[PDB]
């Protein structure tokens, strides 16, 4: 039963928005780029707060999804994260180290650590994968763009020299990079990163907010799935998928078109309020919670995403994002 790996016609509903800013002296104008977990009945979510004075984040859970814009906010600037330019979490647990991690960018590719999900207040000062800074392959292929959207995932190898720890990133510029490091000396030791997928002509092809996911139970040419965020004609986003047989592999096109895309509104059905034609940077929501970032597609995939009112006219930043699930 791997029954919703749904090859090339992947359908789904969408909710309304689900979490808003809330109307505190913060003033955030954009809840964006969550990132997700199911433990016990608690759905637990990092997200990026957005406004033209900066980024930063917060932690928030609930067990309904209707209630989840009642949950209060933790701001992870509270915490040793702290203040300054933070965004885009992806949350897992690195069980040889029994500690939770939060990869994110500040500036670098940066990770936080904490023992206990449930305490936001002790997520750890930033440190980052690449000492010295930005690494050479992207200072010299980045041109106008931005590094943004870190992602870690490791093999499921059982010896951890030879279990190697992924972690990519994109530069608004049409670049995806892949750097690795076994599972014995995670989170030191990443490689320079490699460009393992570029889109020149058209940048926007080949975004942002990459996932990359394994298959559970999938032991071939689909084992491993990989998203990227596309912008379409008319400024829609959108995720176009590939597929390969290892995360450092060769990776073919799954459903990689607007007209057909892995999500976008060409396949989202809102069956409620319809608020959105844009599906961004998004996550799925995991209850298998280990380094490995598998989905058990025995079950539906819930995907909590960030959508915005078409008709929105502000500065990026200040845009009016909102978090919303799309489900099979
Ligand atoms: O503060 C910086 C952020 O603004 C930045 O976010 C990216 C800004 O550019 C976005 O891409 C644009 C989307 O709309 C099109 O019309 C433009 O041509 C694009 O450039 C991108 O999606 C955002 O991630 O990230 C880095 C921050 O320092």
Redesign the pocket.
């Known amino acids: 039963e791997n029954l919703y790996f749904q090859g090339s016609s992947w359908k789904w509903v969408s909710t309304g928005p689900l979490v808003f800013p809330k109307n505190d002296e913060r003033n955030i104008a954009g809840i964006k780029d969550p990132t997700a977990v199911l433990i016990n009945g608690t759905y637990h979510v990092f997200a990026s707060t957005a406004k033209s004075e900066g980024?930063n984040m917060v932690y928030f859970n609930f067990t309904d999804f209707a209630e989840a814009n009642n949950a209060p906010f933790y701001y992870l600037d509270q915490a040793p994260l702290g203040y300054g330019?933070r965004?885009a979490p992806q949350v897992f647990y690195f069980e040889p180290h029994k500690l939770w991690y939060l990869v994110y960018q500040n500036g670098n590719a940066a990770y936080s650590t904490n023992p206990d999900i449930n305490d936001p207040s002790k997520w750890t000062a930033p440190e980052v994968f690449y000492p010295n800074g930005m690494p050479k392959i992207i200072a010299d292929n980045i041109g106008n763009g931005?590094w943004?959207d870190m992602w870690v995932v490791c093999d499921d190898e059982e010896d951890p020299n030879k279990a190697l720890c992924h972690l990519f990133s994109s530069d608004?510029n049409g670049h995806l990079y892949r750097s690795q490091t076994t599972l014995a000396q995670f989170p030191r030791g990443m490689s320079e990163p490699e460009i393992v997928l570029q889109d020149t002509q058209n940048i926007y092809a080949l975004?942002?907010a990459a996932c990359i996911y394994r298959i559970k139970g999938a032991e071939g040419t689909q084992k491993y799935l990989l998203l990227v965020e596309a912008?379409g004609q008319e400024?829609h986003r959108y995720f176009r998928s590939w597929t390969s047989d290892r995360i450092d592999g060769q990776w073919i096109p799954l459903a990689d078109t607007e007209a057909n895309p892995w999500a976008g509104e060409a396949n989202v059905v809102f069956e409620g309020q319809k608020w959105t034609k844009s599906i961004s940077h998004g996550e799925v929501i995991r209850t298998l919670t280990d380094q490995t970032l598998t989905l058990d597609l025995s079950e539906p995939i819930q995907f909590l995403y960030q959508g915005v009112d078409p008709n929105a006219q502000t500065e990026?930043?200040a845009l009016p994002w909102r978090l919303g699930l799309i489900t099979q």
């Open positions: 980024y330019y965004a931005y943004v608004d975004w942002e912008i400024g990026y930043n």
